[PDB]
A paper describes a structure:
To determine the structure of this complex, we obtained crystals and collected diffraction data to 3.2 Å. A structure was solved by molecular replacement using the apo structure obtained from UBR4xtal, and a UBE2A crystal structure. As for the apo structure, the N-terminal ∼100 residues in the UBR4xtal construct were unresolved. The UBR4 molecule was equivalent to the apo structure (RMSD of 0.98 Å), except for the hemiRING loop connecting αA and αB, gaining structural order, suggestive of E2 binding having a stabilizing effect. Two UBE2A molecules are present in the asymmetric unit, where the first E2 molecule (UBE2A #1) binds the hemiRING proximal to the zinc coordinating fold, as observed with RING domains. Several X-linked intellectual disability (XLID) patient mutations within UBE2A cluster at this interface. Thus, the UBE2A #2 interaction is probably a consequence of crystallographic packing. The most notable interactions arise from UBE2A residues Arg7, Arg8, Arg11, Arg95 and Ser97. The guanidino groups of Arg7 and Arg11 hydrogen bond with the side chain of UBR4 Glu4843. UBE2A Ser97 side chain also forms an important anchor point by hydrogen bonding to the backbone carbonyl of UBR4 Ile4840, the side chain of which also makes hydrophobic contacts with UBE2A Pro98.
Residue numbers in the entry:
A (entry chain C): -1 to 151
B (entry chain A): 4830 to 5183
C (entry chain D): 2 to 151
The structure:
């Protein structure tokens, strides 16, 4: 697709970076035709209730990339204090604190590490934020439900 | 496709290997300060001092990021691509295949940035030489670099030196102002020893002319002027120590503690180590003297300079800073081949000046 | 093929079908993004009988961003730097995607006749163009003769 624009030229660079040196637990790739839409899977890291989960999410870029951040949402069902009800991720790096130096690899690692250590004081899901600090048993029980649900796709 | 060896813009991850005509810039932070603190005048003569975390962006990539990010300041916006360390300027570098029309346009943009944060309309190269002088003094006096920005220290600002030097070389070469400062520098060297005490409290003192000599004197001319400049720097330390306000003649001509001479010796060492970084520069006979031969070397050797800068910082940080005696300084500096009497060289110099 | 290259092909057509008098450019045999053009010195000007050869470097951002127009033959002109690059409004600030190789080459030879010393690039040349017209055309003639070698 020519890849003449500034974006795409960067998205190709993010692709080769994510292809030849992908972080552990995450893996992504653009659509076969439209490079402005990527599909990435984030495996649940160990030591957390998200383990053994195949969480899929889609990333949507514009031609303003990398000056403006991409819209990232979870396709798989997610129960996390920093994840809204429609897959939106309440993360500063993806919104106000977005740096034009961040690439797709740095976005996937920030979301991967967000599953291990959530940020409950700034909640997007009121139900998951209260369970992460109060009843650790119900939190890891509801997360195990979406781990089995991540297999249903 | 491939990775870029030299300097890379952190936004588009591309450098000269894929965009050999796009200007690269260094995020800098400049603030309005006094040129000389020991100036006996009530209101100090004003200049500017700059620092950097040494983060690289294309000048177009910087504008594209701040333009698309409406609602926040341009320099509050550039802080995110500058490792969260605030900045207010973008020092341009002139690549080998970059057109002079593009570099001169970016240097004017950086000069306007200096006019805003420092209030100094028309930032001349003289003000820029003092900017290198004040940056050298931050190294020699162990001053903070991250105090006003939030990050970066000697490691960051040691790589800012060659390109901050470059903007002085560029103005000196296009405006043909080399010979004027050449004759102006030789006037400082030929100053009789009665003026030496008075010059230690002037703005264009021995520190300024040392930075100027770095820009217009070849390495062979430096080694000949090393000791003579060393004498003027040592007398500068004693003058500013025994009379911190002002003085015309040396009253206390007795050798003081090494802590009084340490600032000038590290200043001298930092300049000599930079000459060692540029020891491979062609001397002359190449359509210009030293300010031309050095400017082209800085222009074409971004990566050889980077390693030499880290090597120079290593020598400065590991060998020069821990020096405790003036005899040890001449050992590390290597001046024992031409200064055979270290004990007498000091006390005779402070006695030689009125 | 990219949008910039397909546009560069259109630039080659209008420069081969309707080539303005005094200029002639063409891309390199290997790289389409690197052009080489000749601008014959306008008649009745100090640059007469001169064959000044230039180079035009394009990027994939063409035609949204102007190319790197650079002189190869040595040039003594107020708006021409020492490395060949040109301080021209249409090549820098006032660039429009509606311009092409022909509109640039025509605007360059027009600048040889009508320089702009108000915002100069060669201070020694802009000073001679306004103060000493006799000496200005004396060094320009030396640049005309110099453009005949290789
Ligand atoms: Zn860039």
């Amino acid at each position: 697709g020519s890849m003449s624009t500034p974006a795409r030229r960067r998205l190709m660079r993010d692709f080769k970076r994510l292809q030849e040196d992908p972080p552990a637990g995450v893996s992504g790739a653009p659509s076969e035709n439209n490079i402005m839409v990527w599909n990435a899977v984030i495996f649940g890291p160990e030591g957390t209730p998200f383990e053994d989960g195949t969480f899929k999410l889609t990333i949507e870029f514009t031609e303003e990339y990398p000056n403006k951040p991409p819209t990232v949402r979870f396709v798989s069902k997610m129960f996390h204090p920093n994840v809204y009800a429609d897959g939106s991720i309440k993360l500063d790096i993806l919104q106000n604190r977005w740096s034009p130096t961040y690439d797709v690899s740095s976005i996937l690692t920030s979301i991967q590490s967000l599953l291990d250590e959530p940020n409950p004081n700034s909640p997007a899901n009121s139900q998951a934020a209260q369970l992460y600090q109060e009843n650790k048993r119900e939190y890891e029980k509801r997360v195990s439900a979406i781990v089995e649900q991540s297999w249903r796709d | 496709l491939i990775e870029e060896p030299g300097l890379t813009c952190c936004i588009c991850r591309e450098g000269y290997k894929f965009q050999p005509t796009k200007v690269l810039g260094i995020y800098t932070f400049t603030k309005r300060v006094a040129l000389e603190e020991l100036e006996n005048k009530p209101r100090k003569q004003q200049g500017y001092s700059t620092v950097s975390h040494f983060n690289i962006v294309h000048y177009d990539c910087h504008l594209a990021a701040v333009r698309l990010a409406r609602g926040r300041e341009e320099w509050e916006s550039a802080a995110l691509q500058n490792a969260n360390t605030k900045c207010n300027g973008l020092l341009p570098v002139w690549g080998p295949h970059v057109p002079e029309s593009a570099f001169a346009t970016c240097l004017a943009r950086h000069n306007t940035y200096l006019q805003e944060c420092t209030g100094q309309r028309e930032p001349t190269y003289q003000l820029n030489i003092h900017d290198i002088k004040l940056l050298f003094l931050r190294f020699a006096m162990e001053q903070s670099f991250s105090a006003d920005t939030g990050g970066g220290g000697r490691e960051s600002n040691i790589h800012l030196i060659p390109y901050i030097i470059h903007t002085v070389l560029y103005v000196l070469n296009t405006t043909r102002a080399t010979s004027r400062e050449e004759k102006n520098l030789q006037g400082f060297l030929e100053q009789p020893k009665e003026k030496w005490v008075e010059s230690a409290f002037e703005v264009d003192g021995p520190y300024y002319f040392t930075v100027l000599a770095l820009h217009i004197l070849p390495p062979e001319q430096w080694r000949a002027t090393r000791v003579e400049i060393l004498r003027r720097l040592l007398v500068t330390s004693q003058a500013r120590a025994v009379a911190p306000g002002g003085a015309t003649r040396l009253t206390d001509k007795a050798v003081k503690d090494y802590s009084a001479y340490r600032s000038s010796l590290l200043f001298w060492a930092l300049v000599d180590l930079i000459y060692n970084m540029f020891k491979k520069v062609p001397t002359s006979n190449t359509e210009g003297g030293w300010s031309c031969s050095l400017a082209e070397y800085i222009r074409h050797n971004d990566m050889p300079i980077y390693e030499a800068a880290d090597k120079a910082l290593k020598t400065f940080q590991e060998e020069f800073m821990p020096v405790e005696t003036f005899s040890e300084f001449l050992d590390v500096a290597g001046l024992l081949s031409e200064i055979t009497d270290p004990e007498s060289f000091l006390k005779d110099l402070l006695n030689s000046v009125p």
